Paper text:
[name] [name] ([name]) is a complement-like protein that plays a central role in the opsonization of gram-negative bacteria in the hemolymph. [name] also binds to the surface of Plasmodium ookinetes that traverse the midgut epithelium following ingestion of an infectious blood meal, targeting those ookinetes for lysis and, in certain mosquito strains, melanization. The TED contains an intramolecular β-cysteinyl-γ-glutamyl thioester bond that is protected from inadvertent hydrolysis by sequestration within a protein-protein interface formed by the TED and MG8 domains.
The [name]*S1 and [name]*R1 proteins share 93% sequence identity with the majority of amino acid differences being confined to three hypervariable loops within the TED domain. [name]*S1 Glu 966 adopts a different conformation than Lys 966 in [name]*R1, directed into a pocket occupied by a Cl− ion in [name]*R1, within hydrogen bonding distance of Ser 921 Oγ and Phe 923 N (the same conformation observed for Glu 1098 in complement factor C3). In contrast Ser 921 is within hydrogen bonding distance of [name]*R1 Tyr 971 but not [name]*S1 Trp 971. The S1108R substitution does not cause any perturbation in the interface however, the Arg side chain adopts a conformation within hydrogen bonding distance of the carbonyl oxygen of Tyr 1307 instead of a water molecule as seen in [name]*R1. The remaining 23 polymorphisms are generally localized in short loops between the TED α-helices and introduce no significant alteration to the structure, with the possible exception of four (F960S, E1005V, K1009V, T1012N) on the face of helix α7 and adjacent to the post-α5 turn that form a crystal contact within the [name]*R1 structure. The half-life of [name]*S1cut is 8.5 h, significantly shorter than the half-life of [name]*R1cut (6.5 days), suggesting that [name]*S1cut is more susceptible to hydrolysis of the thioester bond than [name]*R1cut. [name]*R1cut also forms a complex with LRIM1/APL1C that presumably contains an active thioester by a spontaneous conformational change with a half-life of 6.5 days at 20°C. Residues in the new [name]*R1 and [name]*S1 models are numbered according to the complete peptide chain (including signal peptide) for comparison with other reports.
Author numbering: 22 to 57, 64 to 576, 581 to 603, 630 to 821, 830 to 1339
């Protein structure tokens, strides 16, 4: 008995079971058929006759839910038989796929993806017109959501930009249809950091015994891509002879080495020889060890027998072929020898055809017992394999062969061939996961039988056919696709049969259905190497084209289950060609594209979906390699300093078939570069070196930098009189001795009626520039992504990537600007900033100072409300997430209305509880009040809070606290607001000479800014002008303020004030008059913001600015001080000591820092340490060791190409916070200027210390190679 039914069930689909009775003992068999959280109880008493099928239908109930289903076939009466099967329930009529242009991404990287949705017929579902897509980071924060992602030919495409410092780990793309997940897919975001490098060892040519040697390519590369310089020790072990061959060589990224054997004579035709390669990186001495077995072969080819079937049939033809291949897998053509099969007196002396085959058609007579297939070549090579005759018990097969085309409403003709003379065999036909048709066929004791079937409508456009018989006591089968060619999407893609060359172009030719969508994608096997463990897309889409994925079960894949008698067995860089295109009118489209300039192997893929004909795929992915004939690779330090002698090291690579002299030319761009030993007027320096094939060859230039700023490193290389070239345009940052702290003096004017005014300015080597700006946000908008000259790696500081964008948009909307480029810029960075800020969200829904830590009341109020506000401008903000944060915040409020700090105290004046919590309480209320939605949904917190302030008001004596309380009261319309502001005013200071008013607290920018906001609420515009005069003049060179909260409150205050006092239109002339000459500026456009009017005064003493007209403007002077680098401390003690490493290339620097407590002030605010390195040094993977545990480093930030390390602390007291930093000398630099370490209080940078340190001095005479060693040496 053979029972076959589908394994999958659906709501309405008729479920057809088939029972085939081939038992010749009885003449009928009686069966019971159960079919069952049991939401089904359908039974069927049923009768199957001898030598016949019986097809039993089952109407599925429309109201099926997910559950556990079974089907049970029981043999009633005198026939024992119990079989059972699990039926998997399907809720969907559709399936989904996600394609992603890469498996792994880096930080500043765009993810591109497509969502493909197809119905049972593999076409776009007509019912489904849009899907619900959501992407979330490794901690499940929603980062982008498409609620109605429209399909086009079943496909939805889009992208996500990963942030500059994003959340690392596994992201999840998730697709939903009608609130039910259809498909999800992960991708990874990793950091290249992994300064560890990979080593590879492979033979450069297939080793043959006659060579008496092995030639090896050794290759060492960092994961990002650059070559590694080191010494490779190569060992090769011959254990039969207790021998060992050694060789050492310096490898610059890639090298070759030949190892010669003495008397190598293998016993067999092959022999594995183990090899070990120890690769020691140059200065670090970081060792990586790589091993492999390397086969030596006697012959350049190998043979295997390829048979039509495993055994041959006694009296029938037997087709097979001897397949010749080289040991790299490729076909081996033209190999000659002599085949003979003596059992048949067969013989042929030929050579392997163009596919490496020698095809054979042997003819065993019925007497023939076996076929001994020998092959012998005159080189001594021989290959023998025996084929045995079919034994029914273990070897019997049945095969199916389509004999006619498969057209709709025509017959389908098949030749069923079996090894046995058949009494019966069965067929089944499936389409859309149900059995359409079946039959019990009865050959009259025949090995062949011609099966004919009418193609029905239910088989369109995709069906399959399975045949099966019983031979011996095994069920043998075979199957075939019924692809109705006239109803299918006949998609195909191809490349011209040429060598595809870097930089040149290739012509993609494709064909299919006119309307059809086409999606193309190419991946380099490199990317597919590091992660092939997870699901490959091409496997996914290929599988959906067919069936459903221990050993290959044909029934599982066909969507079925089979069962039978107990004693019966069954037999057995950037992305490229991510284009979408359409096939057009003539049924073909040619896309033409430029091959990227890189050496790699590609995997090009292409699918196609027609709205009517559905999914179409290419057989296997297209493959080809692109090989740069000649390139050059740089290895430069991130920075150097004026006057230092640096060796710029490069490495050359030649992939042609011969050794060629390369000419490398380093250019002196804009008088930036001195070539040591050559006059200052030279514009270039050319050296030459020979470059063998596939061997890295170094080349270097000794130079000094002449100008601060960015030095262009401009190189050109060529090899055969310029017939092969490569070029590089890179950057080294030339820096000053001491950390330049720029100062900006600014004066603003605001003329309503036509006014003339003259501003004198007294100045005080130090380069200086004047600037005219029509707007507070001009330079801010210009510097939106890099506003501060201070690290910002903590949760509060990171809001500089978020809040300033809001202030910009708040203002651009308030004045109704139509300068779209700006709205676009602020909007985009705001989106990037959301993603970035989520790093600091905590499990409880709050926000903390670090990626993982206790949440902060201050930061949760700051971030939560700020994000609520951001909903105006971007839609990617998770509302539920904001709700959670503000709920966490609200629960922290005391019965009295008071808020206390939570987590670390990083900002004393705000979080401190020395003055009844007035600052923090006022801030939380202020933040909520500033946003109408939050104000509404937490009215209770505001009420209790304002009551608290009302009670504490008499004791509020600190201007910082009072400025926040007052501004909250103004926002709230509290009865005490007028009284609070008056009190605040009473505490104010003035500078009468400068027409300034301000507040002298330890955070005077915040305080004065908060005060100005209240002035603005109270419409005190004239008395506010002196306040603005002061604030405007504390601005950092970018237009922000030098710190974070200073910036957020400061810019809010300045822009708010500006909105109210600024004239309707600008129309003014600024005459800048220095030394003697006079520069002129005119501003007649109000709206305009994007405006340069920079200008460089020389080493000047005084300066005169005459403004005339009407409008608003900022008159700025920027000083670039260059103070001498000198030890200094104020309220911090900082001590450095170099530790003896025993290597000139290793620097172990012990840093110890501590706050100097004084009176009530026992600990600092958040404190950073920055360590800067001497030129040419770089930090290791984890450069910090021997940390003190008392007060741990909360964050380590490595930047500027391992040149700078920033270490963050919650705060310091008089405990000695120590650590040891390890760095290696990666680049040859002489006359090195000293480096330094700084520690400072973040929110009060006046408190800081700096200590200089020097390193052992490399001498110019060691650095240079002989040619350019100057005339002061020997
Ligand atoms: C690449 O595929 C996109 C679909 O993602 C095609 O874009 C659409 O074009 C149709 C009209 O042809 C419009 O209805 C849609 O508005 C477009 N979608 C979007 C979101 O742009 C695009 O035509 C394809 N490109 C090519 C060259 O074939
Ligand atoms: C990704 O999301 C899907 C649902 O969209 C979920 O089933 C799966 O568990 C998630 N992956 C991870 C890494 O948790
Ligand atoms: C092995 O490499 C050496 C050095 O280039 C070369 O001379 C030799 O031809 C190579 N061996 C073979 C068999 O190609
Ligand atoms: C502001 O206060 C600081 C610290 O108390 C003090 O050094 C400074 O003189 C004050 N400035 C003015 C103008 O009062
Ligand atoms: C690396 O090894 C070289 C040579 O053995 C030595 O000169 C140098 O000091 C070593 N560097 C380190 C980091 O130990
Ligand atoms: Cl807090
Ligand atoms: Na001042
Ligand atoms: Na030096």
């Amino acid at each position: 008995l053979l029972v076959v039914g589908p394994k999958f069930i659906r709501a309405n689909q008729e479920y057809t079971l088939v029972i085939s009775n081939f038992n010749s003992q009885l003449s009928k068999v009686d069966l019971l058929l159960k079919l069952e959280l049991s939401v089904l109880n359908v039974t069927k008493m049923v009768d199957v006759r001898r030598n016949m099928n019986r097809m039993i239908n089952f109407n599925m109930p429309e109201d099926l839910t997910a559950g556990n289903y079974k089907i049970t076939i029981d043999g009633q009466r005198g026939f024992s038989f119990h079989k059972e099967a699990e039926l998997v329930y399907l809720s969907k009529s559709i399936s989904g796929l996600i394609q992603v242009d890469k498996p792994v991404f880096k930080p500043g990287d765009t993810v591109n993806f497509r969502v493909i949705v197809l119905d049972t017929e593999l076409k776009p579902p007509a019912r489904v017109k849009s899907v619900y897509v959501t992407i979330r980071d490794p901690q499940r924060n929603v980062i982008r959501k498409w609620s109605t992602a429209k399909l086009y030919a079943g496909v939805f495409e889009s992208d996500l930009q990963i942030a500059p410092t994003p959340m690392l780990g596994v992201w999840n793309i998730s697709v939903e249809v009608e609130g039910e997940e259809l498909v999800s897919k992960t991708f990874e975001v990793k950091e290249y950091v992994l300064s560890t490098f990979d080593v590879q060892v492979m033979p450069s040519v297939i080793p043959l015994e006659e060579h008496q040697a092995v030639n090896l390519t050794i290759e060492a590369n960092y994961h990002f891509g650059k070559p590694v310089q080191g010494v490779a020790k190569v060992e090769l072990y011959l254990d039969d002879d207790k021998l060992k061959l050694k060789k050492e060589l310096t490898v610059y990224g890639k090298g070759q080495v030949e190892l010669r054997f003495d008397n190598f004579a293998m016993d067999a035709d092959q022999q594995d020889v183990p090899v070990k390669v120890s690769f020691v990186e140059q200065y670090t001495n970081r060792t990586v060890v790589k091993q492999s077995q390397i086969t030596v072969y006697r012959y350049a080819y190998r043979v295997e027998l390829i048979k039509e079937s495993p055994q041959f049939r006694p009296g029938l033809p037997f087709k097979c072929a001897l397949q010749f291949t080289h040991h790299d897998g490729t076909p081996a053509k033209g190999i000659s020898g002599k085949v003979e099969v003596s059992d048949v007196r067969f013989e042929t002396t030929t050579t392997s055809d163009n596919d490496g085959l020698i095809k054979l058609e042997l003819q065993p007579s019925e007497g023939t017992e076996q076929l001994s297939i020998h092959f012998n070549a005159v080189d001594g090579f021989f290959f023998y394999e025996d084929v045995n005759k079919v034994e029914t018990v273990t070897d019997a097969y049945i095969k199916l062969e389509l004999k006619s085309p498969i057209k709709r409403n025509k017959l389908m003709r098949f030749m069923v061939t079996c090894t046995e003379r058949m009494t019966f065999f069965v067929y089944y036909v499936m389409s859309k996961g149900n059995i359409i048709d079946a039959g019990f066929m009865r050959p009259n004791k025949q090995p062949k039988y011609l099966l004919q079937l009418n193609a029905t409508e239910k088989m369109i456009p995709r069906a399959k056919i399975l045949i099966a018989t019983v031979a011996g006591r095994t069920v043998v089968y075979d199957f075939a696709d019924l692809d109705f060619q006239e109803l299918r999407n006949n998609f195909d893609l191809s490349i011209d049969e040429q060598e595809i060359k870097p930089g040149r172009q290739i012509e993609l030719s494709m064909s299919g259905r006119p309307g059809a969508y086409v999606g193309l994608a190419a991946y380099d096997k490199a990317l597919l190497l590091f992660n092939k463990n997870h699901d490959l897309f091409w496997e996914d889409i290929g599988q959906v084209f067919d069936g459903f994925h221990n050993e290959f079960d044909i029934f599982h894949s066909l969507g079925l289950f089979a069962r039978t008698l107990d004693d019966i067995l069954f037999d057995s860089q950037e992305s490229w060609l991510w284009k979408n295109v359409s096939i057009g009118r003539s049924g073909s489209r040619k896309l033409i594209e430029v091959v990227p300039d890189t050496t790699t192997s590609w995997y090009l893929t292409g699918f196609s979906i027609d709205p009517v004909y559905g999914l179409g795929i290419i057989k296997k992915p297209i493959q080809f390699t692109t090989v740069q004939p000649f390139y050059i690779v740089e290895n430069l330090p991130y920075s150097i300093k004026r006057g230092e002698a640096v060796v710029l090291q490069f490495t050359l690579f030649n992939n042609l078939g011969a050794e060629y002299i390369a000419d490398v030319t380093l250019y002196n761009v804009a008088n930036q570069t001195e070539f040591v030993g050559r006059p200052n007027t030279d514009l270039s320096y050319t050296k030459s070196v020979s470059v063998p094939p596939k061997v890295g060859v170094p080349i270097s230039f000794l130079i000094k930098a002449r100008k601060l700023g960015e030095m262009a490193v401009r190189v050109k290389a060529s090899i055969m009189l310029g017939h092969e070239t490569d070029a590089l345009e890179k950057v080294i940052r030339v820096m000053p001795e001491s950390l330049v702290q720029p100062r900006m003096d600014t004066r603003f004017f605001c003329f309503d009626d036509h006014k003339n005014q003259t501003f004198p300015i007294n100045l005080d080597s130090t380069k200086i520039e004047f600037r005219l700006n029509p707007n507070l946000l001009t330079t801010v908008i210009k510097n939106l992504d890099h506003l501060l000259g201070v690290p910002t790696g903590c949760g509060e500081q990171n809001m500089v990537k978020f809040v300033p964008n809001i202030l910009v948009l708040d203002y651009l909307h308030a004045i109704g600007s139509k300068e779209q480029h700006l709205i676009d810029k602020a909007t985009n960075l705001l989106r990037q900033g959301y993603q970035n800020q989520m790093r600091y969200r905590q499990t409880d829904g709050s926000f903390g100072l670090w990626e993982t830590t206790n949440g902060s009341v201050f930061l949760t109020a700051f971030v939560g409300t700020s994000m609520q506000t951001a909903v105006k401008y971007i839609s990617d903000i998770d509302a539920a997430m904001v709700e959670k944060a503000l709920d966490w915040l609200a629960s922290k409020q005391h019965f009295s209305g008071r808020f206390d700090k939570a987590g670390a105290e990083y900002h004393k004046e705000m979080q401190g509880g020395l003055r009844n919590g007035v600052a923090l309480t006022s801030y939380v209320l202020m933040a909520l009040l500033e946003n109408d939605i939050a104000k509404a949904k937490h009215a209770e917190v505001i009420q209790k809070g304002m009551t608290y302030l009302s009670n504490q008001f008499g004791s509020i004596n600190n201007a910082y606290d009072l400025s926040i309380a007052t501004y909250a009261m103004m926002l709230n319309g509290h009865t005490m607001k007028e009284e609070a502001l008056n009190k605040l005013i009473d505490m104010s200071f003035i500078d009468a000479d400068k027409n300034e008013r301000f507040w002298n607290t330890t955070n005077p920018i915040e305080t004065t800014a908060y005060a100005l906001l209240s002035f603005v609420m109270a419409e005190k515009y004239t008395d506010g002008i002196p306040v603005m005069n002061w604030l405007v003049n504390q601005r950092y060179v970018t237009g922000s303020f030098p710190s974070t909260q200073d910036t957020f409150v400061g810019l809010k205050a300045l822009t708010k004030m500006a909105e109210k006092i600024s004239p309707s239109r600008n129309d003014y002339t600024v005459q800048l008059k220095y030394k003697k000459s006079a520069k002129y500026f005119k501003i007649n456009s109000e709206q305009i913001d994007v405006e340069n009017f920079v200008d460089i005064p020389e080493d000047t003493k005084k300066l005169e600015i005459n403004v005339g007209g009407i409008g608003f403007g900022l008159l700025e002077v920027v000083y670039q001080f260059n103070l001498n680098l000198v030890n200094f401390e104020n309220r911090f003690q900082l001590d450095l000591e170099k530790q003896n490493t025993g290597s000139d290339y290793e620097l172990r620097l012990k840093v110890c820092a501590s706050y100097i407590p004084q009176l009530t002030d026992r600990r600092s605010n958040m404190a950073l340490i920055e360590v800067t390195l001497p030129s040419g040094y770089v930090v290791d993977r984890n450069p910090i060791s021997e940390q003190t545990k008392v007060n741990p480093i909360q964050k380590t930030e490595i930047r500027y190409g391992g040149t700078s390390v920033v270490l963050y602390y919650d705060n310091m007291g008089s405990e000695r916070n120590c650590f040891t930093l390890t760095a290696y000398r990666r680049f040859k630099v002489a006359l090195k200027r000293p480096a330094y370490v700084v520690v400072y209080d973040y929110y009060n940078t006046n408190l800081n210390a700096i200590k200089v340190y020097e390193v052992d001095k490399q001498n110019l005479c060691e650095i240079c190679d002989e040619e350019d060693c100057p005339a002061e040496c020997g």
